[PDB]
């Protein structure tokens, strides 16, 4: 389970992160999309340049997704409970995918909050998005 | 593991800025830390009880170095990898057991530490560049299993 | 989670093996060590040879706590809590390595419930032991 | 991928006697079955809503006896299996973007088929020996992005 310090530590990293939530959800997608091309699949129905609108749409709608994670990180598997229909059923996305999703989500925080991205919190982050991972990946 | 001109150049001029005697420590520990199992086989490096003691421990940053500086050899011989880490590959797979799920979590958190260091300029474009790189090394560090 | 279908599977499989669970526990562990060596290590104070009495003594602790998490299967957090702090904390299980049983506890059981290991209750055994490992990795 | 002479003895020795019209077809159905997310790249097939659906699909039966076959293939030329695959991986990877995740996956079905068809014959020792095979097979296939 999280512990109280990791739920701590995500929802500091979370504060710093602000207004740029949308922003920072765009660019871990695109990270996503150019390190790993297979993942390009899922979207084609997307333009995946540089600057997509709806890259640009789609990365706040994750980023929406992760602040609700955030503020019920004590009932994820109920307020994940749509997302985790969907991803598994409709969209069939291969589990692997998320360890991709995750890791370029803490390269991006990473890249963004040198100040907040300590061995800790890198940490406590990782386990967080392993944790909607798991629930994403539960139907 | 062919890296166009373009994704050579990125890796490369990026890679001239890393402070080698800080940037294989800083991997490692986080490794650790994050991936706590990897604890197994560092038991001899004694505090690892907190990230500050992990962080801070002499013999992090000292393992780390080398570990960084295989790296920076693989960056050099990107076009044959598998016999710049024949040796290496034999130890950890024949010698210490390792499982080479664990190369690429080292890549992937070296590849944080990058992002971390470098900011706005580790673009999503230098990334993908890395994370070629950092595939490469873990499948020649496992070809032993292979 | 484990739907209503996954759960009568995995007990009417459960329920076919029988007394044998103990020496099915000890062949899934020899599998695991025979076809995934990197596991040995995790053992080094056991003679992990053909007919061991301490492969055996260990594959009847598994089996308990597999039938443990079967009884159990709607409060698995709760029933392995212990077992789960023994993996992650003292003995520092990497994460793979469940997989890898997992995979040998499938094989046995395909190996000796010829009728009862259908393609259906393949899929059920398959997600009640990726439960068991999420469990046991959740520390 | 090397097997010794014991271990290439278990594996020719159990492949002679699979039959090979039902075996590929039985383990294609599972892997669609047991790891669903697979179905999106076999949505042509059609009906797949239930595990017999999937299991008595005529498409399934008949792709993976091709499936199959390339298994044999391999079988056949455990020292060179990069060459035996790389049209496949190809296929697999440039143009079909299967995750190599589940090229293991498919390999490890393939071990519990054969584990039901043929039960206490399928020893412990015979299946460290098809581990070092199915894994072979799915590395060659994930060549193309290595
Ligand atoms: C951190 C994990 C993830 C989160 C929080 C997340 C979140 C979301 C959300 C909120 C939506 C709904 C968008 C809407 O309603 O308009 C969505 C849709 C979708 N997701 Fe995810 N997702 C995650 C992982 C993934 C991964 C790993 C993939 C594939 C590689 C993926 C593929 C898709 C696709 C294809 C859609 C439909 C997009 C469309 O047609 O507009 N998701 N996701
Ligand atoms: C890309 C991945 C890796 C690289 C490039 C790498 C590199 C190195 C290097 C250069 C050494 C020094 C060997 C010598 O003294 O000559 C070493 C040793 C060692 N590595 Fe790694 N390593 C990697 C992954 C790992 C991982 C993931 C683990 C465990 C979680 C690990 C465990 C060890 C241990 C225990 C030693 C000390 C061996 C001894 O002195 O007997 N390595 N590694
Ligand atoms: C299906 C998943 C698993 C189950 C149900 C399970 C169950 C157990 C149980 C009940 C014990 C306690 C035995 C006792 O009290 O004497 C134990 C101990 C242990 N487990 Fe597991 N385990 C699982 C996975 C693994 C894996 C994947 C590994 C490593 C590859 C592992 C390594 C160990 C070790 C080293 C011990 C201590 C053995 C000793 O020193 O006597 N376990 N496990
Ligand atoms: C060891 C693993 C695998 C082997 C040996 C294998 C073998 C084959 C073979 C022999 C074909 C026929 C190619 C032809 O018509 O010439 C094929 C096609 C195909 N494979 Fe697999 N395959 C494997 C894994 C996978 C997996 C895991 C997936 C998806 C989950 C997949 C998706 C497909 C698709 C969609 C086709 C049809 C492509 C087309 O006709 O355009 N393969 N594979």
Not at chain 2, 39 to 57: H, I, K, W, Y
Not at chain 2, 113 to 133: I, N, R, S
């Amino acid at each position: 389970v999280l512990s109280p310090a990791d739920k701590t530590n995500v929802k500091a990293a979370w504060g710093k992160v602000g207004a740029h939530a949308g922003e920072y959800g765009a660019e871990a997608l695109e990270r996503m999309f150019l390190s790993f091309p297979t993942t390009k699949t899922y979207f084609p129905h997307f333009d995946l340049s540089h600057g997509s609108a709806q890259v640009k749409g789609h990365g706040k709608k994750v980023a929406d997704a992760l602040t609700n994670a955030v503020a019920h990180v004590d009932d994820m598997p109920n307020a994940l409970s749509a997302l985790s229909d969907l991803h598994a059923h409709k969209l069939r996305v291969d589990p692997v995918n998320f360890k991709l999703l995750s890791h370029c989500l803490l390269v991006t925080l990473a890249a963004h909050l040198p100040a907040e991205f300590t061995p800790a919190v890198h940490a406590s982050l990782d386990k967080f998005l392993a944790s909607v991972s798991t629930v994403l990946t539960s139907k | 593991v062919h890296l166009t001109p373009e994704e050579k150049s990125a890796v490369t001029a990026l890679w001239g800025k890393v402070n080698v005697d800080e940037v294989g420590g800083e991997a490692l520990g986080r490794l650790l830390v994050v991936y706590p199992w990897t604890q197994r086989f560092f038991e001899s490096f004694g505090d690892l009880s907190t990230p500050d003691a992990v962080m801070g421990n002499p013999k992090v940053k000292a393992h780390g170095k080398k570990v960084l500086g295989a790296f920076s050899d693989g960056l050099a011989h990107l076009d044959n990898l598998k016999g710049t880490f024949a040796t290496l590959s034999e130890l950890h797979c024949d010698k210490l057991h390792v499982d080479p799920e664990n190369f690429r979590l080292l890549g992937n958190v070296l590849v944080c530490v990058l992002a971390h260091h470098f900011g706005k300029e580790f673009t999503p474009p230098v990334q993908a560049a890395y994370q070629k790189v950092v595939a490469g090394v873990a499948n020649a560090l496992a070809h032993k299993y292979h």
